[PDB]
Symmetry: C5
Subunit: 103 residues, 5 copies
C-alpha cells in the first residue's frame, strides 16, 4: 500500500498531482442524461471533473465515484482546504482520481 | 466535456439557465404515491422541481435524481447560495437538470 | 404537478395540512420488529409518525420513506423550522405524506 | 399505533427504558468480522450496543439497525442529548431497541 | 460480546491497539482501480489505511468498510478527536478494524 497521494498517484500511467492548499470555489452537480457528473473550481480557474461512470470503470471503481462526489460536496460546503489532487491529465477537464485533505 | 454549467446546458433541447445568486427560501419533500419528489422555491417566487423518476430515466440517471435530492436538502439547511440552474422549461414546475454553487 | 405543499396534499384522499412554523420538540426512532419507525412531536403537543412500510406502499414510496426518515432527523439536529406537514388523517398518530420547511 | 417510546417499549417483553437526559460520552465502531457493531457510553459508565445484524432479527429490521448506527454517530458528533432509550435487558451490554431525543 | 474497544481487539492475535487522543491530521480518499480506499494521518505521523474490500473480507464487513470511510470523513471534517485504534497488524499501512471516539 501507497501510504500517500503522491505514492498512490505514482502507480498510474496518465496521472498528475495538483497542489492546491485552498478550498473549492464552486461545485456543479449534473443529473442530465449522460452528464451525471460533478465539476469543481478553484479561485485560480482550476476546474476538475469527477467522471461520468462508464463500463471502463470496474465494480469497485464505480461506488467509490459516488463517494468522491459525496466528499467534494461536504468539502465545498464546509469550506475545506484541499491540499492536493491526483488526476488523469488525459482528459479535459482533468479527472480526479484521489484527494488529500489537511489543515 | 463541458467545463461549466452554461455549456452543459447547451448540449440539450428543452433547456434553460437561471441565475439566482440566492439561497433557497423553501424546501419541500414528499413520499405520497406517484408524487415522490422535491420542490424548492426562492424569495422571488421562482419554483423548481426535482422530478419523479420514470422511463426516460437511465438507471445512472435515476441514481443521480437521488443525489440532487440530498443536495437541495443540505444546501437548504446550510443556508444555500445557488448561482445557477439548468432546467427543462418544457416542464411545470421547471425540471432541474443541474445546479451550480458559487460563494 | 403540484407547485407547493398545499395543492399536493389536495391530490390525496384522506389528507390534511397542519401548519406549525416551528421546530421539532422531539424525535424518536425504533429498530424493533414490526415497529421500524420514527415519531415526531411538536411543542404544542402534535404527534406524527413516519409509518412502517408494508404492502399499502409502492416500492418507490419505500425509497421515499427512508429519505423522509433522513430529513426529520437532520431538521431535528439542526432546529430547522418546519412550515407545513401534509398528513394522512386516517391514522393515529397522523402519518406524514409530505413536509415543507420555509425560511 | 404507539405514539411515544414508553408505549413502544412496553409492546416488547425483554425490555426497559433508560432515562439519561445527557449526551453520549464515547462512540465506538467496529468492522471486525462477525463483530460489525457499535457501542455507546454515558459519562458515568452506562454501555449499550447496537447489534451485529443477523438471524433473530427480522429483515425489515436489518436496514433499521443501519440507521440506528447512523443516528448514534451524528448524535455523538453533534452532542445530542438522549432523552430515552428502550433496550433488551437480556443482553450484555444493553441492546438498544429505540432511541429518544427531546429538545 | 465485547464491551469496549480493548475487549474486541483482545479477541484477535494479529491485532494491536493505538491510543491517540488526537483528531486526524489528514484525510485521503482515492477512487483509482484496485486502490479504492482511504488514508488517515496523525501529527505524530501515525498513518492508517481502511482496506480495499478484498477476499479476506466477509460481505457484512464490506458494508461496515463503507461505514468506516463515512466515519473517518465525518471525524476529519469535524475535528473528531479519536481516542483509540484497534488495527490489523500484518500489513503496512496498519489497517483499521475498530475505532473509539471520546469527548
Amino acid at each position: 500500500t501507497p501510504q500517500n497521494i503522491t505514492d498512490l498517484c505514482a502507480e498510474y500511467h496518465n496521472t498528475q498531482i495538483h497542489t492546491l492548499n485552498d478550498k473549492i470555489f464552486s461545485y456543479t452537480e449534473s443529473l442530465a442524461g449522460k452528464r451525471e457528473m460533478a465539476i469543481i473550481t478553484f479561485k485560480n480557474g482550476a476546474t476538475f471533473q469527477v467522471e461520468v461512470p462508464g463500463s471502463q470503470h470496474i465494480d469497485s471503481q464505480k461506488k467509490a465515484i459516488e463517494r468522491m462526489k459525496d466528499t467534494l460536496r461536504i468539502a465545498y460546503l464546509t469550506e475545506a482546504k484541499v491540499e492536493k489532487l491526483c488526476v488523469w491529465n488525459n482528459k479535459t477537464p482533468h479527472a480526479i482520481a484521489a484527494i488529500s485533505m489537511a489543515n
